[PDB]
Design a protein around this ligand. Structure first.
Ligand code: AGS
Ligand code: MG
Lengths: 576, 34, 62
């Protein structure tokens, strides 16, 4: 709309897919060297009282006098009124001039036609300008990140979150960690009045009866051998029959339904079933113990305490035969005694309430409070997972996710009954996803994928959204991305990664890929629906920053030969 | 884009939105979790 | 290997209680790995590929 200025050069080749501009003055190029760089935008004429925006993709300079070349691609159209449409409807003829895009025009276009603003940094050409996107489109849909090492992913994510939590509307966010990093990025002065629930391996409370079928079957059992059939059947039978005795009131229970159910009792039952011996005498078509006393209903005695039975014999007077399931179940008993013997996993098997007593069926509510917290204020929670072993990570993640989806659906229904949309949004942040969401992985992690797949598809309707972070996107699930509506690309170098991230992402010709491996530290590229159009941007450092204190090695070697009092260490090392 | 024997020739079209459309403290009192 | 790792663990606990990070690092150099860490191999070589692995995922800290 305003005075654009003095132009650069005319056109020399045109088409819907490609455009080619040609400069022949060096003094003109060196003056505007900063804008004509890749990613930025240019204006072309397509008749009187219209203009067309193009994205620079490809530059070339030759000396034979000079000859420059700027290849471009079209996005949309703009009038003199100010309106910005989209979708090409014109091919520009030659001998038509071109101009450079000033900021003022971009700011004007940004302000008006944007419904609700959310700031996401500053453009590169000018730092004293703020890039904006739609307030609602972004945080109500599935984001993604991918960056090579050193590209500053963590800091940028921390900045985004800080803005989402008003650190420089009440929002709920959970951030899974693997490095103990994002804890300090929220350690403002206590008086700020925004709740923070830090969790770990010592204080986390998460009973084992909340599991679904796959997790329970996965922790205590391996189905590789020939005995994989019978174990599962009788395990299910045992768990069910033990579920009721402790929860009588309720009705129509099943393997999946969650309520308290001890485990040591199930072990006792399985053992007592290992050694059974039946009697075949008259009117004695049932078991027989050591004290010559039959049994009617197994469930009444087998749980209480181990029992011993008489020996197998064939006498006509003492006719005792062996049981059906004797012998088979020998290993899993020791395997389970072991897993329960583990101290480091105590938080899952043998947990304790604050007072000291074990949990009960009713504390379910509180189990979620930790993730939910206070209702009318932001309650960012930072789970930690370093102390957790490598075998239970998938299980932990699946449970902590399902427990949130259920709540979402429940409050979505509770509000559907009323007729108003839910005002409680929940964001999930999954860091270093490539460890526990493998695309090349098999059953070793089968329990994790699904717990997230749901959010990938359903979550949007209910009220919870994702945010995936990774650094090697090739070895990540094909399904978790495709459901991502917006992409932030920071520096990437490894070729195969370029190929994959170019494929998945639609509006990427050769140049938009030639821009990835030359970005600076702090920059980024944005592609999706939250903006009007693709854009190149720059961030600032977050305050306070994440540190993730670590063991320095060389600075410690230069010190003295510190006496490791092995005595005291091993002494404390009871492990009994 | 349509492909196959039905049309007179391959071709691209666009669809009009179909009206009607397809859509589908004490809060957590479901310990049953069902 | 298991011994090393467990020692580092029980020591990190103490110095963390004290509030200070560890000061006794260890570097395990492994040679001709492919003789005792197979990719396609039997359970006979399942006692090693596990233990050493615990160091990769949960080492930096302790
Ligand atoms: N705009 C900026 N100007 C100057 N330095 C920056 C800027 N943005 C980021 N940095 C620097 O980037 C450095 C390290 O980035 P990190 O946060 O370590 O990246 P990262 O998220 O740890 O990536 P990794 O190593 O794969 S976990 C910090 O020391 C910052 O000073
Ligand atoms: Mg990081």
């Amino acid at each position: 709309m305003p005075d654009l200025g003095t132009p650069i050069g005319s056109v020399t080749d045109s088409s819907p897919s490609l455009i080619r501009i040609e400069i022949s003055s060096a003094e003109d190029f060196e003056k505007y060297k900063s804008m004509l760089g890749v990613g930025q935008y240019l204006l072309v004429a397509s008749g009187n009282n219209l203009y067309l925006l193009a994205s620079i993709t490809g530059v070339r300079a030759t000396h034979v006098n000079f000859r420059f070349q700027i290849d471009t691609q079209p996005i949309g159209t703009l009038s003199e009124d100010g309106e910005f449409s989209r979708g090409s409807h014109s091919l520009p003829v030659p001998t038509e001039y071109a101009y450079v895009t000033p900021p003022a025009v971009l700011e004007g276009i940004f302000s008006h036609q944007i419904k609700s603003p959310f700031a996401l940094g500053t453009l590169g050409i000018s730092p004293d300008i703020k890039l904006k996107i739609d307030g609602d489109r972004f945080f109500s849909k599935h984001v993604a990140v991918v960056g090579s090492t050193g590209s500053g992913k963590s800091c940028a994510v921390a900045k985004i979150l800080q803005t989402a939590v008003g650190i420089e509307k009440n929002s709920h966010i959970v951030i899974f960690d693997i490095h103990a990093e994002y804890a300090a990025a929220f350690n403002l002065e206590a008086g700020e009045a925004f709740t923070l629930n830090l969790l770990g391996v010592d204080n986390l409370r998460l009973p084992y009866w909340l599991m679904n079928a796959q997790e329970l079957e996965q922790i205590f059992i391996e189905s590789n051998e020939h005995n994989s059939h019978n174990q599962i059947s009788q395990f299910r039978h045992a768990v069910v029959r033990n579920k009721c005795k402790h929860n009588p009131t309720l009705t129509n229970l099943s393997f999946d339904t969650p309520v308290y159910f001890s485990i040591d009792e199930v072990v006792t039952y399985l053992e007592n079933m290992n050694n059974e011996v039946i009697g075949k005498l008259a009117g004695e078509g049932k078991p027989k113990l050591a004290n010559e006393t039959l049994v009617s209903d197994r469930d009444e005695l087998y749980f209480d305490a181990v029992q011993s039975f008489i020996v197998a014999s064939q006498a006509a007077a003492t006719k005792a035969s062996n049981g059906p399931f004797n012998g088979e179940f020998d290993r899993m008993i020791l395997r389970l005694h072991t897993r329960l013997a583990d101290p480091r996993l105590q938080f899952l098997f043998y947990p304790k309430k604050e007072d000291g007593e074990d949990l009960a069926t009713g504390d379910f509510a509180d189990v979620v409070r930790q993730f939910v917290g206070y209702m009318t204020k932001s309650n960012v929670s930072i789970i930690d997972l370093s102390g957790i072993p490598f075998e239970v990570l998938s299980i932990v993640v699946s449970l902590i996710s399902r427990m949130i989806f259920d709540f979402g659906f429940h409050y979505s229904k509770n509000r559907h009954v009323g007729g108003a949309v839910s005002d409680v949004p929940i964001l999930v942040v999954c860091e270093e996803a490539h460890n526990y969401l493998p695309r090349s992985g098999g059953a070793a992690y089968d329990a994790s994928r699904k717990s997230i797949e749901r959010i990938a598809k359903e979550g949007r309707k209910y009220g919870v959204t994702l945010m995936v972070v990774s650094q090697r996107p090739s070895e990540v699930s094909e399904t978790i991305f495709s459901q991502c509506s917006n992409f932030i690309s920071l520096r990437l170098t490894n070729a195969v990664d370029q190929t994959y991230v170019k494929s998945l992402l639609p509006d990427l010709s050769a140049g938009l890929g030639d821009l990835l491996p030359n970005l600076a530290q702090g920059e980024f590229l944005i592609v999706g629906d939250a903006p009007l159009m693709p854009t190149v941007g720059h961030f600032a450092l977050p305050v306070p920053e994440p540190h993730s204190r670590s063991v320095n090695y060389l600075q410690e070697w230069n010190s003295g030969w510190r006496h490791v009092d092995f005595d005291s260490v091993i002494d404390r090392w009871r492990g009994k």
